[PDB]
Amino acid sequence: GSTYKHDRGIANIRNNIESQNLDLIPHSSSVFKGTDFVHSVKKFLRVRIFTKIESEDDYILSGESVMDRDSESEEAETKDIRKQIQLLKKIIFEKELMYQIKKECALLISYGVSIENENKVIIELPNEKFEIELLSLDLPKINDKRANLMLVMLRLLLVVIFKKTLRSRISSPHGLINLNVDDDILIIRPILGKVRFANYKLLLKKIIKDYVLDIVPGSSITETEVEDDENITKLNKEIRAFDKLLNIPRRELKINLPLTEHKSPNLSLMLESPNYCNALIHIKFSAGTEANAVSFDTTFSDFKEVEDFLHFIVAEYIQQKKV
Amino acid sequence: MGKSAVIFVERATPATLTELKDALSNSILSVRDPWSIDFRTYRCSIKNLPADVSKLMYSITFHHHGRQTVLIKDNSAMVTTAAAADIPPALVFNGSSTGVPESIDTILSSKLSNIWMQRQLIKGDAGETLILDGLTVRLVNLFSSTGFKGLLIELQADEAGEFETKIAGIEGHLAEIRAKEYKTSSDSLGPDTSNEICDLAYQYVRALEL
Amino acid sequence: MVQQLSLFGSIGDDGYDLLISTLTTISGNPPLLYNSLCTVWKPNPSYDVENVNSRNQLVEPNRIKLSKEVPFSYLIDETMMDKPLNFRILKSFTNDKIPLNYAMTRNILWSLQISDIPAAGNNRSVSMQTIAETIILSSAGKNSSVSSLMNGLGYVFEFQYLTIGVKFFMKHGLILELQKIWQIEEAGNSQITSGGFLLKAYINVSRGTDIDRINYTETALMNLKKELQGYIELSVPDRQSMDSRVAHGNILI
Amino acid sequence: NLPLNKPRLEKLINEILLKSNLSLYNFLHKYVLTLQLYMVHREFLKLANGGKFSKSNLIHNYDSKKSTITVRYWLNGKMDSKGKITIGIQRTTESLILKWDNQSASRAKNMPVIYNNIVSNIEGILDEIMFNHARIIRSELLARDIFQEDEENSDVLLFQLPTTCVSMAPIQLKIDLLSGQFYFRNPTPLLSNYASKINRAEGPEELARILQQLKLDKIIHVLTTMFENTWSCSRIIKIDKPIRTLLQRDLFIRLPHWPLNWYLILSIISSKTSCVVEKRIGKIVSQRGKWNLKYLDNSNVMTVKLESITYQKIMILQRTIL
Secondary structure, eight states, X not given: OOOOOSOOOOEEEEEOTTTOOEEEEESSOOSOOSTTXXXXXXXXXXXXXXXXXXXXXXXXXXXXXXXXXSOSOHHHHTTOHHHHHHHHHHHHHHHHHHHHHHHHHTTOGGGTEEEEETTEEEEEETTEEEEEEEEEOOOOOTTHHHHHHHHHHHHHHHHHHHHHHHHHHHHOSSSOOOOOTTTTOOSXXXXXXXXXXXXXXXXXXXXXIIIIITTSTTOEEEEEOOOOOXXXXXXXXXXXXXXXXXXXOEEXXXXXXXXXXXXXXXXXXXXXXXXXXXXXXXXXXXXXXXXXXXXXXXXXXXXXXXXXXXXXXXXXXXXXXXX | OOXXXXXXXXXXXXXXXXXXXXXXXXXXXXXXXXXXEEEEEEXXXXXXXXXXXXXXXXXXXXSXXXXXXXXXXXXXXXXXXOOGGGSOHHHHHHTSXXXXXXXXXXXHHHTSTTTEEEEEEEEEOSOEEEEETXXXXXXXXXXXXXXXXXXXXXXXXXXXXXXXXXXXXXHHXXXXXXXXXXXXXXXXXXXXOOOHHHHHHHHHHHHHOO | OEEEEEEEEEEEGGGHHHHHHHHHHHHOOOOEEEEEEEEEEEEOTTSOOTTSOTTTOOOOOBOEEEEEOOOGGGTOOTTOSXXXXXXXXXXXXXXXXXXXXXXXXXXXXXXXXXXXXXXXXXXXXXXXXXXXXXXXXXXXXXXXXXXXXXXXXXXXXXXXXXXXEEEEEOGGGOEEEEEEEEEEETXXXXXXXXXXXXXXXXXXXXXXXXXXXXXXHHHHHHHHHHHTTTTOOOBOOOTTTSOXXXXXXXXXX | OOOOOHHHHHHHHHHHHHXXXXXHHHHHHHHHHHHHHHHHHHHHHXXXXXXXXXXXXXXXXXXXXXXXXXXXXXXXXXXXXXEEEEXXXXXXXXXXXXXXXXXXXXXXSSOOOEEOOHHHHHHHHHHHHHHHHHHHHHHHHHHTTSSEEOSSOTTEEEEEEOSSSSOOEEEEEEEOSSSOOEEESSOOHHHHHHHHHHHTOOOHHHHHHHHHHHHHHHHHHHHHHHHHTOOEEESSOOOSSOOOOOEEEEEXXXXXXXXXXXXXXXXXXXXXXXXXXXXXXXXXEEETTEEEEEEEOOTTOEEEETTTOOHHHHHHHHHHHO
């Protein structure tokens, strides 16, 4: 299902005259002619996580992807063809992953994502920094597990993309399989959306606490989340298994204010990220008049206007309590 | 369940549409994209027919409802599509369809031309659609071969509780503009089976008949 | 309306399994099960169509095909739920009997389709046929039914049959079908393709005027045929067998 | 280490010297220049496949007969300029030189237009040209005094926009170093739409008008949202002549329970530094497809500053306006 046209994944078998063993020579790398091919071609993908300090603008290395090595048994690896096959599969998969990451992040400049060189990409967050690098081989920190997890889910998302491509190809012959960058390529979008949605959720929690919880005592807050042939059904099942990760994050917060005279207004705020980066806050304020007479129902994209309307609502509630 | 009604005015003037557009301007909330509609009648060319078998067949083509044709004969409806995006995926997959169909009007007027022949054609283009409070009103001028024919009004609502009141209000609005000869209809083709577009086509047929 | 470019053939069931494997070796895709049900309708003889311009032959009467997909729950008997729903079930479909009988199909009563005899001349390497197609989505009224609709148009039922087989999707929009056909009557069900599978490889062209595309399609079909040389012989069927006009009666099966 | 055809060169040079009257040196120099140009083109071909400028940023056309390379960059740029570079043999020095064919670069001071050592640092030369073009555009914008200067960042432009009635905040606009389209740090849908509008803009006057309209309709959207979060505006009414009180915008609002044809009319007057609102009550009717200003009141015009308007004033006005 891969659309990577640069390499065909073809390896010629050569019986080593000196060692009486079998080696694999790839088609593309026909420039390196020597016994140092293994180390010269051994590339890898590294994820580095830097935590921004609140006192200085510099970033300190807080996590790095753990390079677990299966090549420690060099003599066994240099004579076992299966290990060479697995290593070559990993190399080509990482190359495709890096190319897809480049083509995907080329469109995320407007939200604070940049490309340093042909092998490095950088993602910035108000408190964090992520660096993804393709590097040649030539103390346990806090966030090392974080980087390993990031690498794992990136590989999983690439596999999901391949499965989607194969399913679309099998479904119909006429459909030209030309991937759309805006739609098909979804790798950094889910992770970035989750992180920024968590940041915005924390920010709105703080805003609500400052402007409502600290001002109006007794408010109750509740947090909720709102959701023939064997081969096609198998692929549908496997793809649907990843909905909880690929789907757009959502959050809902219901605030009930304790008021007398059997007039209890409700404040339901649902936070969404329709394009995986922007924050949309939908506010539904129901005054204590009827169960369906929604006093106000608005949408907001600027947190400043959110705070202004929250202050106005608090003032209106105070005036209602004063009358 | 949404409800719809159709009112046809035969003695209208060229400027009556503008008069009704302005007379409702106080309640007009918004305006949307224009629409079009086609209305053909096909005749039976065979003479050895029974007395109880009808001779006509009315074809109504809706342009805004995703390019769909409806064939009507003796209170019997048939809905055909011609877009590649309306095809149920099973028919594409199994091979029952080549994937790029044709409109049924081409079939009637090309291959079955020895059984059915065209008799008239009434068209409506560049209509206007207005969103009022819980209502959508569409207006258009009808043009036959000879020339201007009349005015067509179609009303669609989602809540069926107060449909009759809205119809009466629109009738009164036409009344102040002194359009006194208008034929309205909101009937339903089948009391038990409710299909929206079939009922709309039947209401069009009942309004446009002479 | 399409120009369908097609090639035909047949095989004995003995090689069936083997054939399947070879196809997967070429296309790189697995087969997908499918079924269908076709009903043929003809103009009513009770009505005299004098409108056929006898002195000019502007048009001749023809036959209409209505097709529909039927779920496998009607085709699987009580002995077969244990096996998974894949292609191997076709190996058990060698008997003239089938779970779907006349009464169920009568209870059923879509895609409407009309065709013409292939193009004349002996300089044609593939069967080129013209097809006009439309789709029926739903209906309503006091007599909403396919039979009542086709009687309203002026057509009556003639016969029907059931196809079961597998599909292969290759590059360039080429579709390869392996079929088994069961004719159905109140008298019973008879498998016309007895002890074998009917093979049909075809492509569709949307516009008949484009000739570069048609040349490309013919090139692909002849390349496919030249790939299968020695195993199965794909041939152009008889031009007089694919004629479906009412005046003359025969049915390629 | 190049595999030179030594014997063919021997016969060629011997024939030239035999037919020589100088010519050998000229032919050698021409061949050296042609080889350098060809290897520069080969380097361009190698880079374009995987380079940062692959996506339509740079296009190079090479002519052997004239032995010149034309490079076009920033195809989606209409700011009264077209990025063009010519690499060719200099007549005076008989050497291959690169010239950035731009009138803006022509009258630019203390900034070299012609560069050498193209083979060694072609990427550096391209980056320098990119940065110089961006700086020239930014300096022109600053000279027009539409964007204020950012002290912290020399490549970031500050645009002053009022987020609320009293707030007056700067927004950071940045220039893409690859294709050259202006972009915001955290653009809203309207902000993204107007950034896209800026991208295909053609004239400096067009750009100034675009920014003025951006400020105007941003204020209009803010106040319309303020009204709707508490009010039914009308988006259908267009008056032939603007109402007599520098950009003037008329907004016609009402409530369902108001008397017919009576509209609260707001005339927003926006200047370069200040904005005011004229609140009046009028009567408008529609006849034969035309909007007729049936009546306007001028003795009770409420002239209000932009900052002073608040929610409580809005609701008090709602109560008193009936």
